[PDB]
Amino acid sequence: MKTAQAHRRAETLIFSKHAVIALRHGRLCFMLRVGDLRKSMIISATIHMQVVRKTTSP
Amino acid sequence: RARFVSKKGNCNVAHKNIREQGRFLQDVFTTLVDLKWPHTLLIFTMSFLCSWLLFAMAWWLIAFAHGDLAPSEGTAEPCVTSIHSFSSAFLFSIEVQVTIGFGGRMVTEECPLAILILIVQNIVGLMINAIMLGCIFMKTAQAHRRAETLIFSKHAVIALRHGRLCFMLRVGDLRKSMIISATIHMQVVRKTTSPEGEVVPLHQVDIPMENGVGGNSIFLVAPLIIYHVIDANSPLYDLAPSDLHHHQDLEIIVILEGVVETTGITTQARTSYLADEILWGQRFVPIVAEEDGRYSVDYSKFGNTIKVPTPLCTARQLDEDHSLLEAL
Amino acid sequence: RARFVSKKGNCNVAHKNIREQGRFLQDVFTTLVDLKWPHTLLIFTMSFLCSWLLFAMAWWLIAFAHGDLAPSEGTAEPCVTSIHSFSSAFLFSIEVQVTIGFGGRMVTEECPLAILILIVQNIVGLMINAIMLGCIFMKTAQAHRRAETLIFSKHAVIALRHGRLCFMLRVGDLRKSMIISATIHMQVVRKTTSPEGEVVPLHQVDIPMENGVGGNSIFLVAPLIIYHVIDANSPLYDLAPSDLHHHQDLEIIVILEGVVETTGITTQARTSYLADEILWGQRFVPIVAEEDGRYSVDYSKFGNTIKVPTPLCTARQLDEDHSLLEAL
Amino acid sequence: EIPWRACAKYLSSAGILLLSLLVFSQLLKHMVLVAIDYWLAKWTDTVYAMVFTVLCSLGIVLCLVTSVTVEWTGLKVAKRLHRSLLNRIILAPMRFFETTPLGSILNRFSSDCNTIDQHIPSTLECLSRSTLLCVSALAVISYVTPVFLVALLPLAIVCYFIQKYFRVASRDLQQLDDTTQLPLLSHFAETVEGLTTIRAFRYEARFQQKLLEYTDSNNIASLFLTAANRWLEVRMEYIGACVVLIAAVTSISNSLHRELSAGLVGLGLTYALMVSNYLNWMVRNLADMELQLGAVKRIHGLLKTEAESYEGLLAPSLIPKNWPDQGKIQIQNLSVRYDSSLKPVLKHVNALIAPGQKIGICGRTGSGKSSFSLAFFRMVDTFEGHIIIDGIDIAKLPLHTLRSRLSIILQDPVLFSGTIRFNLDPERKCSDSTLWEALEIAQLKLVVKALPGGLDAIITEGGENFSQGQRQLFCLARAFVRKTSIFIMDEATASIDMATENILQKVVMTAFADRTV
Amino acid sequence: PLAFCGSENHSAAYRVDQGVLNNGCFVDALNVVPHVFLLFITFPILFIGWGFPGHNLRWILTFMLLFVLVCEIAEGILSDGVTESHHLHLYMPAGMAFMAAVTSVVYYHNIETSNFPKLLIALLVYWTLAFITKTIKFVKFLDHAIGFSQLRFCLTGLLVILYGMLLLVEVNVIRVNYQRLCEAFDAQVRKDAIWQALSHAFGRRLVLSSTFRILADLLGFAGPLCIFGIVDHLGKANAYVLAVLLFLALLLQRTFLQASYYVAIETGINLRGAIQTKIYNKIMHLSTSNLSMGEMTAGQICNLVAIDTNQLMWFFFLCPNLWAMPVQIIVGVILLYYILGVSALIGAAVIILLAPVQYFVATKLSQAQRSTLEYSNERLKQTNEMLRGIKLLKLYAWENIFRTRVETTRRKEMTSLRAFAIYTSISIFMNTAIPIAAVLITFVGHVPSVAFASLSLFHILVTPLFLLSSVVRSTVKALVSVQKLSEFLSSAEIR
Ligand SMILES: Nc1ncnc2c1ncn2[C@@H]1O[C@H](COP(=O)(O)OP(=O)(O)OP(=O)(O)O)[C@@H](O)[C@H]1O
Ligand SMILES: Nc1ncnc2c1ncn2[C@@H]1O[C@H](COP(=O)(O)OP(=O)(O)OP(=O)(O)O)[C@@H](O)[C@H]1O
Ligand SMILES: Nc1ncnc2c1ncn2[C@@H]1O[C@H](COP(=O)(O)OP(=O)(O)O)[C@@H](O)[C@H]1O
Ligand SMILES: [Mg+2]
């Protein structure tokens, strides 16, 4: 169970240290870069972007 | 011309200038477990042989240092009984680490260091055996060719269906086993230029496939036709005949992802179609037929197509001319 | 009539003329691990027996070649001590490869080739043992019948619900274990003809099931009713009584996909309903009832249905006549 | 495979206590005969004599129980097979018969069950004792010389391969035998059935030449069969002879240079001789039992029949005894079809029928009117609409009463081989006065008075004793003995002359003024 | 015991080494190794599924190899008749090679014809190794061994070259009427009951095949003579010649049996043809008022040309034994009184009493069979008519009535058939149980080769009894059959 683990495959998936916001198709869009370092493929790659803040209900 | 994906699913990408590396020797562990059978076998055999020789040099050297090889006085008792050559010490090492231990070659209490070497060799043998077992298991529990029994057509076509222009290709499974949760992602790749200036070299856009739900779930038993309806939203809505050719910046990647029926692993197959493999105005010859209480699927003429007369303008111009004809 | 899927989920498909084959003997490896228990056991036993006899012939033959069986002079020392028949060499082989090694039958340094055979047999024994362990583990870690404890009704019905015509069938789980991420795909199969000319022999269309979200997630504890609302978009929107019968080109495939609770493997069950098993104007007798602080589910009369008066025209004609009645 | 499943169905048609008796009695008898003469060879080099006699008695009583076992199990298998086959094929719907040729379904009750019940027990005991004596002699020749094993293990494989080759040839060869033998019997039937037209046409020579050609062809086929059998038997017998030589010389060498006995020498050579004698019988009997079990599998497959649905969704206590009243009939939307793949020959038909002693249906042929007649007895699928007989639907009654309480007269007259009483009275509950009445009202009694027996003369072979007219008359007669207030006729005037036609019509309409025709 | 080549303390040096390949035993066993290699390396990879250049050339080479393997097994078993230690190195390698070649062919056509090629490297290596070992044996067999039995040298070189041809094949595939006329003439000559003409035109072939059968079972019956000779010669180089003579006797025996049986079956087929022809002719001349009024039905008319003809065909298959067996039994008595039963064979009196019991079984079975066949014809016409027109039985709803009516006839027929089965079981048991009675009686009546030769001969004599058990059945059946024929061939004839 220990040596069958990669456990660093989560460390070969990198993101950009910064994020930008620019124009695309006339609309304002938030952007960032993501890349894989290993030559292996990732299966069923899925992304969830999720904003977090202290909101106040109406 | 630098195809992004090879027909077999190989990514012809060059990953230059990767700054950080060298995490730990579990990466080379996986390199081991993902390797050719004869060379993996050779690595295991040399692992055992090197272990045996290392501890064999050890036993021989200790017995020699106990002043036991020479005298044979009788009144003295060896670290280990009855070893009289490195050959003897080597056989002893095999008998120990393999846990055979015939008995003619036995450890005696006279040498604490010998007991230490025994402890060390037992630990090393157990750990190395466990490593070999984990490797061989992780290796032979793999299909690793289930991605090679999932075939696609060597070409793709575009034809008419329900009056709309649709992109089509064939996919089929060769093994009689089922694929679990079969999912398709078609994705167009090109060098696009933003209406605001920027350019994206290998920009990718997920072109949705057509399905009754609109999802991506397919049920691959007979080789079927994956097709996309070219709506106005489709990136190919501005595609035309005589534009597609080997020197045209355009590619379509098809990605099949599904869990293998037996093992809970998830295989993936990739294929690509660029502007020369995409035939126009053809439809795949149906290879499915009714047989004596069955469905014969002739996998010969699998990707075989046939020409069908079709308009020679863009889906954009299709919709324009169709509205021009239907406005009266 | 060549049912596409058998009631138990068997695909009655003939895969003729498969050009490429013969990848490697890991395919037959999987064939091994996916096999009947007595024959798998027999294969393991014959693997060990053949190993033992092969190396036993080896030891016997070497001892014979050392000129050790005949002389018994005493001044000479055998390759291996105290073997005097192929029976002895065979017991020696067992003692070695099984790592028992009593001790009366011991290797001596006098024969380098004997040490070589020892090394070879140890490697072969370790590798064959690891293979047997991986096989037996991959084999007994499988449920392989979890797809047989997921049942469907032998028939399907079509009735009225919220004034709309809906296709229905029952599904239930027999084990008390839970299924994880239960997902349903209903898929109509027929020989369709394109409005542009082409024909598709076993054309498939994913008929979406009805659910609160519209997704495909179900939570199968009590045997529930999978149903599809026959909208105008449904392929069955042009279906009628007296059209469904054993000689009608129409089939409905139901596919349940879900992760087994214990093991992270994903099981799949298939079933089919063709135009004779699809009852009309009936509703399943509710088998769920309240009991003394529980819900008794009588799995008898599981697929038991009851006739209910319903219109005898197509959902198309349903909507037409309903608009005809509601327009005033 | 095929033999496994066929023989398993065969034996499963018998009990399991029978298979126990059979198998274990065979093992015991043969093994004990082997043991007794082995121990006799031991008796070569006294209470021994007493126990020898008691072993002989054991052998004889075991053989007795074997024989009775075989006979009684053959009996039971045959009885069960025939009875179930009859009760199941008779249950089939009309589609089975109208679709499957009657000769094909008849061949089973004719020859196949005959083949079973007087050929399978014999071949069974034959190959049973053959194979088991063979295997026993084999075990013993292996024991009396441990060297023979390394010659036998080859011999079994040689046997296996070549007999498999022979059987794979023989399957096709027997298929050819059947496809050559069927035209024979088909020609005999098509000759007996149309002899009058043949002798009229005078083309006797042509058909004699046709049958001569068929006969020559079937004889050539049987000759090929025979040649193949000779080939394989010669092969296997030379095999057995080589085995004898091996075992014999081996035992010789052994004993006269490493003594064991003379008796066991004899045992070896004698069981070698026995193998040589009984191996071919084992194989030939195996071929014969394979043929017969193929026939058994044929009957078992025919047994896989279609249901009848005689159980009607109603309560037999709710339907009154004198159920059919004056006989109102409301049919509507009666869309009908023969099978699911057929077209709705009669569709969207409604008609309300009060009583009134008669109605009428006419029209050209192919109009699907005999079909409209069949709709009263649910023979047609009637997939839409329904009929209502004065109170209740038809698709809820048990077909038995549904077809017992309503009469019919078919177009083609179908009669029975027997006396007149049986043709009119299947059950023996009808006073003969009613019989004479039903004959006179159909204008038959005047013919019967000239007939010596008097409702007693035999009708032969479905009716080959009178005119098609007279056959149709008898049909009407037996259809009249019923007290039904309604019934239907399907063109029961095609064989009637105009005078008898009008007379019969007036008489039946006067006699049935309350009944609905 | 169980030595590979060890006989004495002199053979306790039959494994010493002044050069291993000089030791014939060593090369002999090294021949064994590659065979076991292939055998136990191809077992599992075969059970997994069981649980082309020169393809036909491969078949032919394989058959030649199987041939010479069997021959070598025979030679090796023979070569251990002089020594008293069973030194089996002579033939164990041969049988191992045999099993290995069989496994080889099996594995081949079970892998490449079915699953996939490019695994045949195993078979390749096996052919290489076997070729190497046999070349070694041949080379060291050229000079060292005396090569007295030159057949050894010949088979050795043969196997060498044959393994060579196999290895070649492997690397190559790795690179990628008249009778009826006489019957009618005989019927006319007899008439101016059929058996008369039948025999008068047809019996020469019958008695000819029966003559072959008589000569055959006589020659075969001359085998316990061989047995008695074997044993009383072994009691105190003549036994080999005599066992070979037994083998030759069996060969001639069975080659005469095949001739007799083939002639008999030819006769039966010709007879079936002629009788079918005559029946069809009579049909062509037949009247219709008879088929309509009096007796016959198309059903049973075709039923006879089927079953009657089959019965006669099988009976004239099985009849030449019915004539040859009496010679066998009388020569049995003669030869018992001449050998080892020179007096006091009282057990044969039971066989004397057997024949009348068998004839009584015959006539009682005939009494059963008459009723069996009449009720069979009854049930047969019943079901015929019941299935001819079934729409009536369905509509008029008389299924139960006719079903039970047919069941009555079926039950009567079943009673007759039960009596028949009782009688045939009586016959079978009497037949199988008189020989053990006979041997018991003749053996206990005394109060080493004598009683045993009796045992063997009485088995030989009980062999034909086992067939006579059903011969008499077919006999009664053909009796009733010809009765039916004589009944049918006497009907009306429209001029
Ligand atoms: N060439 C590279 N090879 C491997 N990993 C990299 C590389 N460049 C960036 N990363 C990873 O991406 C993450 C975020 O990247 P970041 O934008 O910080 O790169 P950076 O500091 O600008 O380096 P550079 O100037 O080389 O792009 C970092 O944590 C780093 O580990
Ligand atoms: N009959 C088949 N059996 C196995 N694999 C096949 C078969 N047909 C096609 N494939 C696979 O599909 C891929 C694309 O097939 P492609 O369309 O090139 O076949 P093709 O050139 O049409 O050959 P053919 O005309 O014989 O069908 C190939 O790489 C091949 O591996
Ligand atoms: N057993 C059958 N199977 C299939 N079709 C049938 C059968 N019997 C009748 N038909 C069809 O029904 C039509 C007429 O039916 P029917 O009423 O029996 O004859 P008619 O109309 O002459 O009285 C015909 O065209 C025929 O094709
Ligand atoms: Mg009609």
Author numbering:
A (entry chain B): 169 to 226
B (entry chain C), C (entry chain D): 32 to 359
D (entry chain H): 994 to 1038, 1061 to 1532
E (entry chain H): 2 to 52, 68 to 192, 262 to 277, 286 to 329, 353 to 563, 573 to 620
Question: What does the primary publication say about this deposited structure?
Answer:
A broad and rich body of literature based on decades of study describes the biochemical and functional properties of KATP channels (Aguilar-Bryan and Bryan, 1999; Aguilar-Bryan et al., 1998; Ashcroft et al., 2017; Ashcroft and Ashcroft, 1992; Hibino et al., 2010; Nichols, 2016; 2006). These channels were found to be large oligomeric complexes composed of four sulphonylurea receptor (SUR) subunits, which belong to the ABCC family of ABC transporters, and four Kir6 subunits, which are members of the inward rectifier potassium channel family.
In the quatrefoil form, KATP is a symmetrical tetramer; each protomer consists of one K+ channel subunit and one ABC transporter. The TMD0s are bound to the channel and hold the four ABC transporters akin to the leaves of a quatrefoil. In this structure, both the inner helix gate and the G-loop gates are closed. In the quatrefoil form, the SUR1 transport modules reside coplanar, that is, in the same hydrophobic plane as defined by the Kir6 and TMD0 elements. In the quatrefoil form, we observe a new interface formed between SUR1 and the Kir6.2 CTD near the ADP-binding site.
